[PDB]
């Protein structure tokens, strides 16, 4: 009966988690991902998930799933339903830089890694937003390069510390979206800096992508950008409904990282109706249905925009789906989440390192899926509060 003494350091730290506040709970979700779902057997509101388009649950995504393991098998073993959806994404997203190719990775983190290890080395500064999400810092810090942190979307502190780097290679990356904030990043005056110092601009669309810009091309797309020096990476199990990432840039660029980023980062792939139900998904995003899904978002957030205005807590200002409400410490922030799920409205409360110390906050997450009664018992639930 022999006994791993560490069993005792993890077992001490999970009670240290407990009074802290920052215990995390996964819920199971016996129904599909949308507006209504059912957990524990009680039916619920959720705004928890980043299904921005409510498009997980969408029939048209389903039927492609089936087809498409019908088609190709249900494991990868690159099929031809991968390939041809890196042709799909680059007509799609690739619209600001002529010959655009796109790469299609099994999770946006390796999407980050193959792009900033190809990228970066040894004497490549790499500059980047202070609240760029944790994949991005991971993906960094990998790549050996020394990495410099900007203020957030600061770009009078980020073009001071441009012209104090005489760095051979520079880069600088940046969210598009800012996952538990909302708020979009200065694209333009970030790619200005980029072309001034001869850096690739990457950014990260994850939250972005489907939701902004004509036809949801996303955050380049709604700045209208054109340029070479733009390396643009998204996510496609947010607002498309699916899994998996891209990346998508000059055909140079995506032909460089084929050649030299890590070899294993190409070896994992979602299965093969993934990709063709991302390819479906790509058609209705583009379509007028995504216009109207869109069109209807847009209305649910200038609605809740108002709404959090009008409780005693202080809103993070976002023009996007992620709606943050700061409460202050993680205890008032719980217990407003509860009070919440107790009126069958499931909204997150995000606590530390996630966010800053003192700034613990629900996450109400919109999808157009969300009908404006559920709007109305969202608006109860706070107002009760």
């Known amino acids: 009966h022999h006994h791993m003494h560490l069993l005792d350091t993890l077992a001490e730290g999970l009670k240290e988690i407990d009074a802290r506040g920052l215990r995390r709970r996964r819920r199971t ?3 599909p991902c949308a507006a209504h779902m059912t957990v524990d057997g009680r039916a619920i509101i959720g705004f928890a998930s980043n299904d921005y388009l409510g498009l997980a649950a969408h029939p048209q995504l389903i039927a492609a799933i089936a087809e498409g393991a019908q088609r190709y ?7 031809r339903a991968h390939a041809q959806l890196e042709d799909d994404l ?3 997203v690739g619209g600001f830089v002529e010959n655009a190719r796109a790469l299609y990775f099994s999770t946006g983190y390796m999407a980050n890694l193959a792009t900033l ?3 970066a080395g040894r004497g490549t500064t790499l500059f980047s937003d202070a609240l760029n999400h944790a994949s991005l810092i991971d993906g960094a810090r990998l790549s050996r390069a020394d990495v410099q942190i900007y203020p957030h ?3 009078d502190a980020l073009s001071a510390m441009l012209e104090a780097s005489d760095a051979d290679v520079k880069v600088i990356v940046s969210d598009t ?4 904030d909302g708020d979009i990043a200065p694209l333009p005056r970030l790619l200005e800096l980029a072309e001034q110092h001869g850096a690739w601009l990457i950014v990260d669309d994850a939250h972005g992508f489907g939701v902004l810009g004509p036809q949801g091309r996303g955050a380049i797309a709604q700045a209208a950008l054109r340029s070479p020096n733009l390396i643009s990476i998204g996510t496609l199990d947010k607002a498309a409904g699916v899994s998996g990432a891209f990346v998508a840039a000059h055909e140079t660029v995506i032909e460089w990282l084929v050649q030299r980023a890590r070899p294993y980062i190409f070896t994992t792939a979602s299965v093969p109706a993934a990709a063709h139900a991302v390819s479906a998904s790509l058609r209705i995003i583009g379509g007028e249905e ?3 899904r869109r069109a209807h978002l847009q209305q649910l957030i200038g609605r809740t925009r108002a709404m959090l205005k009008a409780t005693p807590w202080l809103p993070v200002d976002s023009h996007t789906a992620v709606q943050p409400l700061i409460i202050g410490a993680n205890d008032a922030t719980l217990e407003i989440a509860a009070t919440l799920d107790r009126a069958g409205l499931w909204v997150p409360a995000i606590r530390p390192p996630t966010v800053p110390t003192g700034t613990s906050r629900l996450r109400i997450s919109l999808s157009a899926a969300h009908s404006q009664a559920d709007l109305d018992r969202l608006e ?6």
Do not use: I, N, R
């Open 73 to 79: 098998g249900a494991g990868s073993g690159h099929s």
């Open 380 to 385: 109860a639930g706070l107002q009760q509060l």
């Open 153 to 155: 979307c600061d770009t």
């Open 290 to 292: 995504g216009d109207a």
């Open 29 to 31: 979700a016996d129904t």
């Open 117 to 119: 290890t190809a990228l």
């Open 177 to 180: 979206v800012f996952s538990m």
């Open 90 to 92: 680059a007509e799609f």
